[PDB]
Subunit: 258 residues, 4 copies
């Protein structure tokens, strides 16, 4: 039995170069979806048809991607908003400049907002489709050292997503959130290695430092990119037709409240 | 590609006679699981090996089922606690007798507690497994007319489940909650028909009365039993290995908060 | 200016022998309220008129207190449900017996339920009054070692309280929850001292052990009994006439989610 | 007994011209605080020393107010961030322009962020003080017609506030949120009257239309400006010394979840 498939579905998945983005692109293709993804620069190995080059942190980039989506897919059945991250330095709330706030909002909130504004009305007119906003456990569990503005932007995204669900769910478009905790990437593995040029070393000890900083991960490990992809594919499928306006956390139990 | 399967997995699914319980039993069997389910009386059509007869609202019934599980399955990889419901009359909090409170707790909370106490330690010793507590959106969104004690019992279940996840997730047993809104069953369809011997009639109008009572369902319809089964099977599978200590709501958007 | 007073108000405050219970009794008397409080045995120093002797963990005790309230106060304007606690040993969920579950529910949930059932309808008939359910941060942030059933019972209480608020708030009775974190009592100070007959000693070090177990208290200290009383008196006063159906946390920031 | 006072305390209360802002200014002055408040233009009746003229929706305005605070108060013990509102038209998420998003963020989020960045470090250096972020129930309960961006901005504010509390609470500065539902103002009373030039008329009927739009208010009426002021004064006082990192909702029970 083929429990789940995405055959025929046209999907825009933002930021599919690496990490969970790449894993989600890869899984969607496995499941039969036609995929368009985005990056500032196309990675050398993958088909030109799969990528549109753009800076989604700018309104010009969003305009380009929305149009490319229309031209390449002809329409969208699934949007997965994966673009996100934080580049702010540490030092707490008072070390955040106007630039930092603008950067955090542009990356984590505005790309989804701008793309949705362009693409969702057509989905509503058709009367079917799914939008997945990838938020972050920091939206409920903020970590202040360098991610105060990151957390705030993800909280804006989460509530924006719920608001949109209230509007478009009655019209047949589902809108869900996926909220990951720590995801194991090349970047994070190197971060774990880094925290070992400082006191300690062992890598495992480095990962422990990171996990303790989150308040501990009951599962004892971060999520793999493929595991985030798994949840997103499930939510985008017809096996999830009654799921909308909800946030599905994938964090190994990190968020410690019920 | 076979995205999801449950081959080899041994599953206890409580209360599998009808509704979402029956749909979950049916889906698990489709996906290759060995299933044991429970009811006060076996339905006439289905194999004797599939059912254990017991009253899970009593501690004797729970003792019987735990032992039957050991004898028939030899061990458990997945427990899905589906037993739940409310038999209290209306009249608000002051119309709830001591019997009503006892009944609501015994049905919605104590069966899971008693079974988990017996079965989960062996899963922990093996170092693998999944427990699914089926709660209810009323645990966060209580409706006072007849379901004040029902809501309270489901809230106890939800927090109990989270507590257990904190303890056993580090030992390799995942513990998740599935929180349904209104599920379309034979009982509810007849309820919709009933609210038409009162003012109105149209059935569709009857379902509207029910949905308005919930504060509205953005999706515009209740969940189907098969849709609840879909989510439970996903959570029980290895595609969900990083998901624990979380509650996954399936309610068409009913809960109106982010 | 006398910002706040409780002159003329008749208050039942359960479990007022010590800790926050005693501090709340004391503050209410300071603010002009007529108070009735409860204990298994009256403390030697305080007026007989102030206390009714009863075991509120039994339905007989609740019946006695409700009647004593009617006889001594003639009516109730404010009920503060402070009775709560946990006597379960450690060992996690599987070490909880049927007795443990019964004890936790009887102490933390059933006394409020039984008393409310008797007393609240008269408040509703008058069309004014306040009920304060003292819950616990464990209702959202459960700690599994010895307090799995305690957390579950407090979650039941919290959702029960919200359900009741939906019913009686439109009739002019406010129903609010106060959710304390760690409260500094004689018992807890001795617990801090105890964890020093084990590794360490310093008392301050003992309090650190406790706080770390909670995941840390940002404020850096537990709440004082008087501080819990402060919040309860505010909520019971006419300065809080628009506050109902809400839970007010007093925990020095312990709960780490927004 | 003088339960509560704010004598000696120096308070910046933003946006104190009308509504809850004016009521909070008035109450703080009653309780002995030295107050500085803000508006685009000073209302004709009140002392020049009480107001600084500025447009807090701009970074220049925030710079002006922070400096005026330093000159007029010499230091700040309490900041109450009351500035907020929405000017977006209806039409749902797709009717929100880039200007709308910028306006909603600048008004509801950025004024607090910019002021806090300037003023909070000095409070931290002193080791005492309170910051109150006035959010909105829409941060959890978003209403999509015209307030999608408003809700998102208030959610950003709420999580930002929690993040800051984690950082500065250990240093002796408390950071709390007050989350109002509908507040009765001149503007809203006229809105109620307006919805009567449309179908209906009765004013009471107009207020019913508004309340139904919120999903109903169990209390049956909006909060008064003075009632919001009451809660803010309590939270700013030494009677609330153990309350930090929490959000206190004042909405007559509107938010329907526990
Ligand atoms: Cl990677
Ligand atoms: Cl496939
Ligand atoms: Cl929704
Ligand atoms: Cl059925
Ligand atoms: Cl299969
Ligand atoms: Cl967990
Ligand atoms: Cl004490
Ligand atoms: Cl007084
Ligand atoms: Cl309520
Ligand atoms: Cl006004
Ligand atoms: Cl005063
Ligand atoms: Cl905090
Ligand atoms: Mg910076
Ligand atoms: Mg009854
Ligand atoms: Mg025990
Ligand atoms: Mg607009």
């Amino acid at each position: 039995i083929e429990f789940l498939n995405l055959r025929g579905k046209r999907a825009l998945i933002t930021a599919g170069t690496k990490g969970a983005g790449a894993a989600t692109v890869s899984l969607f293709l496995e499941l039969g979806a036609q995929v368009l993804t985005t990056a500032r620069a196309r990675p050398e190995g993958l088909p030109e048809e799969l990528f549109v080059e753009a800076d989604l942190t700018t309104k010009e980039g969003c305009a380009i991607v929305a149009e490319a989506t229309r031209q390449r897919l002809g329409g969208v059945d699934v949007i997965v908003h994966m673009l996100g991250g934080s580049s702010a330095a540490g030092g707490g709330f008072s070390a955040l400049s106007d630039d930092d706030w603008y950067n955090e909002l542009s990356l984590n909130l505005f790309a989804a907002v701008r793309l949705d504004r362009q693409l969702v009305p057509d989905m509503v007119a058709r009367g079917s489709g799914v939008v997945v906003h990838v938020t972050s456990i920091q939206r409920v569990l903020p970590l202040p050292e360098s991610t105060t503005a990151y957390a705030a932007a993800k909280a804006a995204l989460s509530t924006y997503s719920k608001a949109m669900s209230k509007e478009v769910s009655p019209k047949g478009v589902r809108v869900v959130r996926v909220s990951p905790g720590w995801i194991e990437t090349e970047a994070s593995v190197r971060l774990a290695e880094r925290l070992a040029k400082q006191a300690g070393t062992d890598l495992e000890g480095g990962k422990k430092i990171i996990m303790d900083g989150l308040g501990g991960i009951p599962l004892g490990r971060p999520a793999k990119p493929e595991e985030v992809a798994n949840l997103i594919a499930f939510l985008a499928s017809d096996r999830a037709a009654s799921i909308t306006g909800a946030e599905y956390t994938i964090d190994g139990g990190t968020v410690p409240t019920a």
